A = this chain, B = another copy of it.
Amino acid sequence: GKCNIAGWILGNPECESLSTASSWSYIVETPSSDNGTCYPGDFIDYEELREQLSSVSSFERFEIFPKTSSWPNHDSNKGVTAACPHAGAKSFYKNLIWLVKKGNSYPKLSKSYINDKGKEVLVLWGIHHPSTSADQQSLYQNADTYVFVGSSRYSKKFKPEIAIRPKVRDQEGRMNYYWTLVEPGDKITFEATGNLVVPRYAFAMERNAGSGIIISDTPV
């Protein structure tokens, strides 16, 4: 409908009403679609993700890192923004958690998930890039942080870029979105001292080749 793929995958507050099919033959977006990446930022290799998802023989969403039990040392409730409102309230993406310091600290974070069930798993996460050093102190406390993510195939260290940027959807900062696929038998790990937005939901799937995306107002 009105959502684009990034909205649907990230869990834009307005894409919650969309139903989920276990298999898709092709993907349809309307030309009027304009819901995704509500917190301004880049979605890396977005076109490649869109291509991979165009046809799926089997798809399921599951909670990869449960919101209430996975992060006892971090605050998983204050992670909201006016850029992604829900019924007028500050909110955030349904499939992601923006962790912030608990009390006055952000203990080093370390998590993993083992994909031993047989489907490939799409894992998304993102990185917060605060407008200023005051926001880094408000949200993470650790002044100089890094984020590290990896698997047997993926390995990347990220470092936040704090700067005042032009204001978009009232934000002077940015949040970038990254993703990878975890092949069966492998594991994905996350490590951070701040600025990491973590998945709570992830998608298990089996892909088909040869389909695509149609942009149209033609009814289904």
Contacts and interface: CB of A to CB of B under 8 A. Distances in A.
20 contacts: A40-B152, A41-B155, A42-B155, A112-B166, A129-B155, A148-B161, A148-B163, A150-B163, A150-B165, A150-B166, A151-B166, A152-B166, A152-B168, A155-B161, A155-B163, A155-B165, A155-B174, A156-B161, A157-B161, A157-B163
Contacts of A151: 166
A141 to B, nearest CB: 21
Contacts of A168: 152
Contacts of A161: 148, 155-157
- Nearest 9 CB-CB pairings of A with B: A157-B161, A148-B163, A150-B165, A152-B168, A152-B166, A155-B174, A151-B166, A155-B165, A157-B163
A46 to B, nearest CB: 13
A83 to B, nearest CB: 13
Chain A: interface size category = 10 to 19
Interface of A: 40-42, 112, 129, 148, 150-152, 155-157, 161, 163, 165-166, 168, 174
Given A150-B163, A155-B163, A157-B161, 15 more contacts: A40-B152, A41-B155, A42-B155, A112-B166, A129-B155, A148-B161, A148-B163, A150-B165, A150-B166, A152-B166, A152-B168, A155-B161, A155-B165, A155-B174, A156-B161
Nearest to A151: B166
A126 to B, nearest CB: 14
Contacts of A40: 152
Contacts of A174: 155
Contacts of A150: 163, 165-166
A129 B112 CA distance: 20
